[PDB]
């Protein structure tokens, strides 16, 4: 009834199910659909679906997922002291964690279901977007310590190529993905 997950029906169905997909009301007022709370929902089938992942989507698919999950956890812990002090006193990587976390929650963890092509997403396309995000973070954090401002790394033309990657078809996506990996690896070589 009132949000309020301490209900009898909710706590009675909560003991038996193997996946709990909590929806929010503070997260569906920004029109951020689907409104699944990624900090509070859980699954119990993750340990059992790992050999299927390793034989049918990638080989490093669970580790890439765990890196995405720990970036989301790090941004979630960091956002409260951001709401304390603002985006100023963040050191340098404290801000890059926020920007990669926002690229995650506005590219990967957001899906229209009214768009023609952004309603379905096979495991390959989600894995490609995950490799783009973690390649951007891995190759930008190593480039932020060779003397690059945080106010330079954001305005690249490849960040839009990450952001609109969820709007391409299932057939156009591998030819888009390898060229986007070339652009991410090549837009940091000229970086200074």
Partner 1 sequence: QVSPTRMNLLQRRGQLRLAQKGVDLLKKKRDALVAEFFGLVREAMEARKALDQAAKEAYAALLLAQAFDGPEVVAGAALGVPPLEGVEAEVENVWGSKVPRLKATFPDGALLSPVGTPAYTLEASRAFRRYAEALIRVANTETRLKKIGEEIKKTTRRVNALEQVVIPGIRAQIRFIQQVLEQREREDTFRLKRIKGKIEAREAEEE
Partner 2 sequence: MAVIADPETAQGFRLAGLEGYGASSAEEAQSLLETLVERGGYALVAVDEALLPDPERAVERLMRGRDLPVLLPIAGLKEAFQGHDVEGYMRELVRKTIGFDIKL
Partner 3 sequence: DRTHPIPDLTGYITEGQIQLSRELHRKGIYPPIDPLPSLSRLMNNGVGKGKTREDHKQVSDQLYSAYANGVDIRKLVAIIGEDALTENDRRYLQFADAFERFFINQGQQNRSIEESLQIAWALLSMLPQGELKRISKDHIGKYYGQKLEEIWGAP
Question: What does the binding site for partner 3 look like in residue numbers (CB under 8 A)?
Answer: 1-4, 25, 29-31, 39, 66, 69-70, 72-73, 77-78, 80-81, 84-91, 94, 106, 112, 114, 160, 163
Looking only at the bridges linking them, the beta strands covering 19-20 and 42-43 are antiparallel
Burial 23-56 (b: 16+ CB within 10 A, else e): ebeebeeeeeeeeeebeeeeeeeeeeeeeebeee
What's the rounded Cα separation, in Å, for the pair 124 and 127? 5
- Nearest distance, CB of residue 32 and partner 1, angstroms: 20
Q: Is 62 helix (H, G, I), strand (E, B) or coil?
A: helix
What pairs with residue 43 in β-bridges? 19
Q: Segment 86-105, which members bind partner 1 (CB under 8 A)?
A: 88-89
Instruction: Identify the burial level of 113 via C-beta atoms within 10 angstroms of its C-beta, where 0-12 means exposed, 13-18 middle and 19 or more buried.
Output: exposed
118 binding partner (options partner 1, partner 2, partner 3, none; Cβ < 5 to 8 Å by kind): none
Binding-site size, partner 1 (CB under 8 A) = 11
Asked if 154 is part of the footprint of partner 1 (rule: CB under 8 A), the reply reads no
What pairs with residue 20 in β-bridges? 42
Asked if 160 is part of the footprint of partner 1 (rule: CB under 8 A), the reply reads no
- Nearest distance, CB of residue 89 and partner 1, angstroms: 5
- Nearest distance, CB of residue 155 and partner 1, angstroms: 19
- Nearest distance, CB of residue 150 and partner 2, angstroms: 11
Pick 150 or 165: Cβ nearer partner 2: 150
- Nearest distance, CB of residue 89 and partner 2, angstroms: 5
In the list 28, 48, 49, 81, the residue contacting partner 1 (rule: CB under 8 A) is: 81
Q: Minimal CA–CA distance to 97: which of 43, 122, 126, 133?
A: 133
Chain positions contacting partner 1, by CB under 8 A: 2-6, 80-81, 84-85, 88-89
């Amino acid at each position: 009834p009132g949000g309020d997950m301490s209900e009898p029906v909710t706590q009675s169905t909560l003991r038996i199910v193997g996946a709990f997909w909590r929806l929010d009301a503070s997260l569906a007022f920004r029109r951020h659909f689907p409104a699944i709370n990624w900090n509070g929902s859980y699954s119990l089938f993750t340990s059992a679906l790992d050999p299927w992942y390793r034989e049918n989507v990638a080989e490093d698919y669970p580790e890439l997922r765990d890196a995405i999950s720990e970036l989301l956890q790090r941004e979630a812990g960091l956002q409260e002291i951001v709401q304390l002090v603002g985006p100023d006193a963040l050191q340098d990587a404290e801000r890059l964690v926020i920007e990669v976390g926002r690229i995650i929650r506005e590219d990967f963890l957001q899906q229209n279901a009214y768009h023609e092509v952004d309603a379905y997403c096979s495991m390959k396309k989600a894995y490609g977007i995950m490799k783009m995000i973690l390649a951007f973070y891995k190759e930008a954090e190593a480039a932020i310590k060779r003397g690059v401002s945080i106010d330079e790394i954001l305005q690249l033309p490849v960040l839009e190529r990450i952001g609109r990657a969820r709007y391409v078809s299932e057939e156009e996506f591998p030819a888009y993905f390898e060229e986007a990996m070339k652009e991410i690896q090549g837009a940091f070589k000229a970086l200074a």
